[PDB]
Amino acid sequence: TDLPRLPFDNPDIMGIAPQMLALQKEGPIARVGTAGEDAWLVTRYDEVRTLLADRRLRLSNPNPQPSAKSAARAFMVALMAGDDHETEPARHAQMRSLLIPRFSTRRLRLMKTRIEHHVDELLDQLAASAPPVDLHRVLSFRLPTMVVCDLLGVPLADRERFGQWARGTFDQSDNEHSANTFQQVVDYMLELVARKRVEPGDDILSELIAEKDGALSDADIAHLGNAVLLLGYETTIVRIDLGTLLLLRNPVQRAQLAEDPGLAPAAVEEILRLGVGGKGSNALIPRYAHGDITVGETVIRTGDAVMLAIGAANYDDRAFPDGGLFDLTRVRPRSHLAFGHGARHCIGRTLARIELTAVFERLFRRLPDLRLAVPEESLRWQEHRITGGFDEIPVTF
Ligand code: HEM
Numbered sequence: 598t599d600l601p602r603l604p605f606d607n608p609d610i611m612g613i614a615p616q617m618l619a620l621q622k623e624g625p626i627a628r629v630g631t632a633g634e635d636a637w638l639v640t641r642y643d644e645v646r647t648l649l650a651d652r653r654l655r656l657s658n659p660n661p662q663p664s665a666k667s668a669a670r671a672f673m674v675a676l677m678a679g680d681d682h683e684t685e686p687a688r689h690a691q692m693r694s695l696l697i698p699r700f701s702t703r704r705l706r707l708m709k710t711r712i713e714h715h716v717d718e719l720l721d722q723l724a725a726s727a728p729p730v731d732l733h734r735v736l737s738f739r740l741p742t743m744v745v746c747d748l749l750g751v752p753l754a755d756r757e758r759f760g761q762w763a764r765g766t767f768d769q770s771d772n773e774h775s776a777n778t779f780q781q782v783v784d785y786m787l788e789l790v791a792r793k794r795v796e797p798g799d800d801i802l803s804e805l806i807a808e809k810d811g812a813l814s815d816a817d818i819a820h821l822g823n824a825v826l827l828l829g830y831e832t833t834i835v836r837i838d839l840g841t842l843l844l845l846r847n848p849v850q851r852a853q854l855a856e857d858p859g860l861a862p863a864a865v866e867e868i869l870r871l872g873v874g875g876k877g878s879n880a881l882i883p884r885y886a887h888g889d890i891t892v893g894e895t896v897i898r899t900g901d902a903v904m905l906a907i908g909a910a911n912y913d914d915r916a917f918p919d920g921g922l923f924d925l926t927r928v929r930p931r932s933h934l935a936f937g938h939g940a941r942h943c944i945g946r947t948l949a950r951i952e953l954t955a956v957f958e959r960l961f962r963r964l965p966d967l968r969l970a971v972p973e974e975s976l977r978w979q980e981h982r983i984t985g986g987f988d989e990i991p992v993t994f
């Protein structure tokens with residue numbers, strides 16, 4: 598008897614920690630320690646998917662004496678309208694109602710075209726440069742920040758101002774840095790709302806300003822803009838890096854994709870499913886029980902914390918035969934959980950899929966000799982950031 602303690606060690610730079618796969622083999626749910634509260638850890642696909650659709654399991658904390666959180670986690674929960682369990686139903690419903698129509702089929706088709714041209718240009722710049730090159734700086738970082746500039750209607754150079762703010766806001770190791778970074782985001786967004794009130798364009802804040810004959814306050818609109826800025830590029834950057842690394846590890850699949858770029862949607866779904874970095878603390882969706890819930894033989898009690906391991910569930914052999922293998926020829930794969938499921942299902946997921954498809958349609962056809970310029974083991978996953986990620990990806994080609 599030894600209580601498992603999150604985060605678990607992972608001897609590889611990607612994948613699922615061995616201890617978490619061991620727990621998955623024993624059963625769907627286990628009690629574990631963490632750096633803070635103890636929590637229920639749910640690791641099997643069926644149970645994670647069921648619990649993500651359970652309205653009794655919510656982001657907000659219902660407890661009278663709530664455990665202390667990092668500034669970074671507090672900001673993340675507040676951006677997601679989860680900071681007050683009594684107002685979360687109305688506030689979260691409004692948040693999704695206001696953001697979902699900002700990603701319309703008209704907008705996504707226009708952005709798909711612009712994204713494809715931008716990838717072409719980014720890869721031409723890359724191909725013309727002298728290796729070794731940092732792929733993270735010149736490709737992974739550049740496409741999703743371009744997209745956020747487009748969503749917000751700001752000059753592309755603005756991403757040189759805001760490009761580190763998601764990392765800084767979500768730095769769990771430094772509350773002062775987290776809070777100072779978030780104030781920069783807030784000031785920038787309030788400036789942007791005031792500009793869009795007199796100079797609107799085809800962009801998200803302009804649409805929110807016009808919503809309900811201007812019924813929303815500038816603070817309400819800036820709040821939603823802050824969610825788009827802080828959630829809308831960093832995780833996509835991380836998936837471009839993880840997808841590149843996964844494809845570099847699987848040369849037979851990589852050659853399949855280079856030969857037939859029509860395999861890119863299937864590759865993107867495998868990248869999302871398998872793309873887990875380091876100790877994988879970002880591949881856990883946190884919840885609190887607002888009512889008692891039974892999982893198998895186990896009772897989750899009102900007030901308990903729950904970690905839904907979407908990463909482990911996406912590796913679950915019960916849901917994906919040979920679940921640890923990258924295979925873009927899977928026939929009718931189950932829907933992975935990398936965008937979540939249920940009430941808080943990723944709002945940007947169709948846009949994120951368009952970005953990743955445009956990149957991986959092109960990458961290995963444009964740079965067939967691309968490969969790491971350093972050992973994989975030298976790549977360092979940043980455990981202190983809620984969103985993890987690598988800081989650099991040196992390549993040659
Ligand atoms: C590959 C990139 C991405 C991944 C892997 C990802 C993953 C996720 C996951 C797992 C959730 C659910 C969190 C939870 O249930 O607690 C989520 C929510 C969310 N995502 Fe994404 N995301 C990505 C890209 C984006 C983009 C590009 C946008 C917008 C431009 C975006 C906007 C949001 C928002 C606003 C939420 C909160 C939804 C809610 O709380 O109702 N995400 N994302």
Ligand SMILES: CC1(C)C[C@H]2C=C(C(=O)O)[C@@H]3COC(=O)[C@]4(CO4)[C@]23C1
Nearest residue numbers: 828832879880881882883983984985
């Ligand atoms: C809103 C989020 C940025 C989406 C989710 C994906 C993430 C990631 O891939 O890094 C974030 C990690 O931390 C979380 O609590 C998550 C898992 O819900 C995320 C919050």
